[PDB]
Symmetry: C3
Subunit: 62 residues, 3 copies
């Protein structure tokens, strides 16, 4: 709603995106089996859903 | 210019970055031909240019 | 501290994340040796540390 609340929302979104970014950096390093990627997939999907919720929330608060 | 306008700019930047982030997550999953990556390349490049414009705009608005 | 300062912090965080995002896009394109990835690793690690400092700073400023 307010400026502060929105600022906090944006920061949380950035924090979640950083976690996803770190997962991709790690994944690329590993590529330098499928089943061995199960946890990575789980995390990537969970953070993607988390970021989606954060963006929608931010959009709703203008 | 104002706080609200800047907040909206930052959100749009985050949204564009999320699209690019999703493209990289998808790309890594695919790596777990070249010609088959044409659309991915197109999208990655377009979002990169989009984000660049959004950042420059934000920088200009302080 | 203030709204403006926080807004600037968020923008710097987004800018740093964009650099890391570009590194991952580039890395995926290359994957479409290990030793040949030394500079990429160096940059990825440096930007990750840079973003970490920016997020912690933003968290500290609320």
């Amino acid at each position: 709603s307010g400026i502060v609340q929105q600022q906090n929302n944006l920061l949380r979104a950035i924090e979640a995106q950083q976690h996803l970014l770190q997962l991709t950096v790690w994944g690329i390093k590993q590529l330098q089996g499928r089943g061995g990627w199960m946890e990575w997939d789980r995390e990537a999907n969970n953070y993607t859903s988390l970021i989606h919720s954060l963006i929608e929330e931010s959009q709703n608060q203008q």
